[PDB]
Every structure is written in structure tokens, then in C-alpha cells.
Amino acid sequence: VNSFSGYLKLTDNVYIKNADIVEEAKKVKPTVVVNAANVYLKHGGGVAGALNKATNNAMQVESDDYIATNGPLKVGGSCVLSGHNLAKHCLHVVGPNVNKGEDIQLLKSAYENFNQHEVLLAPLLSAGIFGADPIHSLRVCVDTVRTNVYLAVFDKNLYDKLVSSFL
């Protein structure tokens, strides 16, 4: 039993809700919140900018030190950093950006990072400003993640389309 509330069950391990991941995180304080990051951990907009803003820029300050020490992430890769006031940990995951010419097959590699965590609150990777089809992202998520994932879909119209089209 966990404290996630109001989710629709899609599969044995995947759940979905029309909600802002930032608001879900503030309320639940999950062990892991996933950020839809880029390789530079530059949290400008979308999920990343919204999470970072909610931490009063502490996520960005921590991230800049991470990059100065370790260099950029790989597309498809991840790192675990603090969740600040929103969660115990933030798993920063980089899905491919099709606007940058990055390979969509890397979306599966990105979701594989979720399997290192028993329970996660997450957005659909590569959706929104990353330019990929959110329906496809949900399919890859369901077919790749085996741990328990709670997906927050910020756009209500998109949520309804995802549920109604889900096979």
C-alpha cells in the first residue's frame, strides 16, 4: 500500500493520472520523482523547469555541481540527485529529443533506468517539448518498466486520449 491517490490502473505495475507532477510530488513526497532532463541538466522548462522552480533553484545549483564534476549525461541515461523539498530523490532521466535528431529507440533505454527503483512518480519521457508522441511513450513505458510507476499527465485532453487509446 502506498499513498498515491486517484490513479487509473493501466497494467500490473503502471498507473496514470491527470495531474501536475510538481503537485503530485508536493503532496505525496515520494521516494523518487523522475525529471525529464536534458544531457546538460539545464532545467529550463516543461517538467524540469517546473520541478526546479518548485525547489527555489536548489535543483539547478546541485545539478551544476554534478555536471562540473561528471560531465554531461548520455541520451538514454540518468543520475540520482536530491529530491529537495519534493521527494527523497530525483532521478534525472534523459529521453531522446527528436527535434535534435536523436534516435527514438533510445526512449526504451531511458525507461530502463526506472527499473532500478521499486516505486516512482514520473512524467512520460520525451513528450511535451521533447517532441515525441506521448501515445508511443506510454507504450514504451508499459513494455519496459517492470517496477511500480505512477505517471502524472499534466494535460487533461492528452490524458483522455492516452486512456481511451490504451491497448
Ligand SMILES: CC(C)(O)[C@@H]1[C@H]2CCCC[C@H]2CN1c1ncnc2[nH]ccc12
Ligand atoms: C507529456 C507530459 C509529461 O504528461 C506533460 C505534458 C503536458 C502538457 C505540456 C507538455 C508536457 C508537460 N508534461 C508534464 N507532465 C507532468 N507534470 C508537469 N508539470 C509541468 C509540466 C508537466
